[PDB]
Paper text:
We report structures of the Mycobacterium tuberculosis isoprenyl diphosphate synthase Rv2173 in three forms: apo and two substrate-bound forms [isoprenyl diphosphate (IPP) and dimethylallyl diphosphate (DMAPP)]. The protein possesses a canonical all-α-helical trans-isoprenyl diphosphate synthase fold that is dimeric in each form. Two divalent-metal-binding aspartic acid-rich DDxxD motifs termed the FARM and SARM (first and second aspartic acid-rich DDxxD motifs) are important in all-E-prenyltransferase mechanisms. Rv2173 is a homodimer with a canonical class I diterpene synthase fold, with structural analysis identifying some conserved mechanistic features in C-terminal closure and supporting its annotation as a short-chain (C10–C15) product-length synthase.
The apo structure was solved with a dimer in the asymmetric unit in space group P21212, while both substrate-bound structures were solved in space group I222 with monomers in the asymmetric unit, generating dimers on the application of crystallographic symmetry. Consistent with most E-prenyltransferases, which exist as homodimers or heterodimers, Rv2173 is a dimer in the crystal structure, with this biological assembly supported by native mass spectrometry. It is these C-terminal residues in conjunction with the aforementioned lid helices that are likely to close the active site fully during the reaction cycle. There are some differences between the structures: the IPP-bound form shows IPP bound in the DMAPP/allylic substrate-binding site with three divalent metal ions bound around the IPP and the complete C-terminus closing around the active site, while the apo and DMAPP-bound forms are more open, with some of the C-terminal region disordered, supporting suggestions that the C-terminus is important in substrate entry/product exit. In no case is the IPP binding site occupied by IPP.
Residue numbers in the entry:
A (entry chain A), B (entry chain B): 0 to 348
Amino acid sequence: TMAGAITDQLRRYLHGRRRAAAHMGSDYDGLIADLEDFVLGGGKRLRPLFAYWGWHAVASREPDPDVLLLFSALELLHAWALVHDDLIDRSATRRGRPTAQLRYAALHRDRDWRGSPDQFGMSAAILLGDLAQVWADDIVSKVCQSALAPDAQRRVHRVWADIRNEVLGGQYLDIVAEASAAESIESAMNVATLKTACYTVSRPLQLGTAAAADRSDVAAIFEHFGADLGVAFQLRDDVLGVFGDPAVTGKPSGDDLKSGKRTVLVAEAVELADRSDPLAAKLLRTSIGTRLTDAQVRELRTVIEAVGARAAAESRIAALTQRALATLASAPINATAKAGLSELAMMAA
Amino acid sequence: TMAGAITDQLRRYLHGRRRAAAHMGSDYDGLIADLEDFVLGGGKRLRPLFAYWGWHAVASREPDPDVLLLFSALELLHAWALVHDDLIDRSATRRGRPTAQLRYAALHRDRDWRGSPDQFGMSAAILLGDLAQVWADDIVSKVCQSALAPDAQRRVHRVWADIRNEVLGGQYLDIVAEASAAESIESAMNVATLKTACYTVSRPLQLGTAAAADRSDVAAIFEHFGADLGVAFQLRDDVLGVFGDPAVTGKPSGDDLKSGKRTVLVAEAVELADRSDPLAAKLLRTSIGTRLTDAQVRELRTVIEAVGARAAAESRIAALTQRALATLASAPINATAKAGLSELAMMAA
Ligand SMILES: [Mg+2]
């Protein structure tokens, strides 16, 4: 499959960088090995696949192996995003396994090392995320020099600068929204647009289009396609974060309410409750982002259901997915890319 | 001066990126403004100046303004290193001014925001350092495509990949050495070579040489030059970190011992004490990295001086600086670069 060919390019790149850095000792080599296990650990490779279909949409032939490596840089970049995300969220586990700060703090305590184990774990986690960022970037620099004409080089860099600027802005806007208790739907839609629409769908699509051809028409359509599908992805995640199966999602029931996320679903519930039951709106406003018992959480989830927020989210997802498919159907791109992107928009739900 | 022209290129670059990111709101704009304030806050511009003399050594003409912007990328990269360093060290101030995590925790309290102000400060500081890194790299990508021939592009990327790989390895090796109580002079020499020799002198020099010409002979000589002068810089800092006047250094008296650093000075003191005062060696071994009173610190400083570690460090600094100037005198480079590098090696030492 295409995800495996993209992943194999990344495995060979990481293996080469690791070997070339072996003179720095076995401790740094162990950190690189940790990065290999996290990045290559397995997944759908959603963002590199969006880059492929963006290339397929405006290209005739298949990309060179080095261009597949360019698409894989989005996977290495995502490791940077997730590792620093786990520090910002103070998450203990990811996919059932301990986060980086916990793995290195436990290593500190197993070795009977001195100083604070938790300080070492956070410091090592910062550096682990930093390494993924500089190496994901080094891929783009290396592939641009070796496999791309200078015009494709300039188009690729401008997408690469935007996607890293937008995911950093999205991260900061999110912690500001949670700290300031931003209630509005517009605030949550802004974060979802930067974090999910731009970072996961639109900009990956434009990376493959930029590497293939000078098609500003298609890049603008993919931005409109990603703005609808990306928000649909976020709302699905928000619904699952409140009402989903914990054994499936990996997070407890009502986790978003537990953690105090400022989702569109939450913002929509406060707005609907303002019109239907002001006392339910006051319950939501004073409970979100606080330490909630299991009973308080079940009550908040039911109130979100009672005022129609979940039903409103489901129709949002249906409408956005339908328009995104309509934008895809009438796009001046190869029909084979229209099939794979409708496939991917469904395989990724 | 040359530092001002380099700084002006960075200020104009940062102003452009800030304006182009204005659509992301006033909160993210305040983070970028804080980045401008920190990077442009003032300094020697030591690392961009090393890059200039590396260019001057093998070039005929002066660099174009865009190449000065390439040299300024080292200053933006240094903000990434310092911001994340302040998090790794849990430092509260830097040169008398609060660190990033403290500035953003104060913003959180000023706004009466929700959650932990210190957790917000650490998260914002992580993102701030991440932003400096991606924008420092966006400079290198932008200048390479627009102002450099493809061969110079490839030489510049190789140095850019090495300097960020080596400062990350030096950071991890340092926290591992402190946590594992690495006593050897070799371990401290390895960290000082990566953190100071490579990162501050050698690689910046090679960045300017790479941007100017294909001179493998000069790049290898600057590596030998930086390996001596860079360690001499660190040994001077280590002596000042233990014996320096707080009015001159700006740091407390005996700060390195208070902070528990694994310096060559401390490593050499343990080795010298093993020969002359074995019980003083045990006092050093069991006190470095612990909570020390002001009397314990004064006691350790006197022991370090008594066993001759301070005098050994002074002769190391003298020998390394003398050999570095001898390597500079016999280098196949322009004599004007030989003068500026001897002057630059003096203004810093
Ligand atoms: Mg680049």
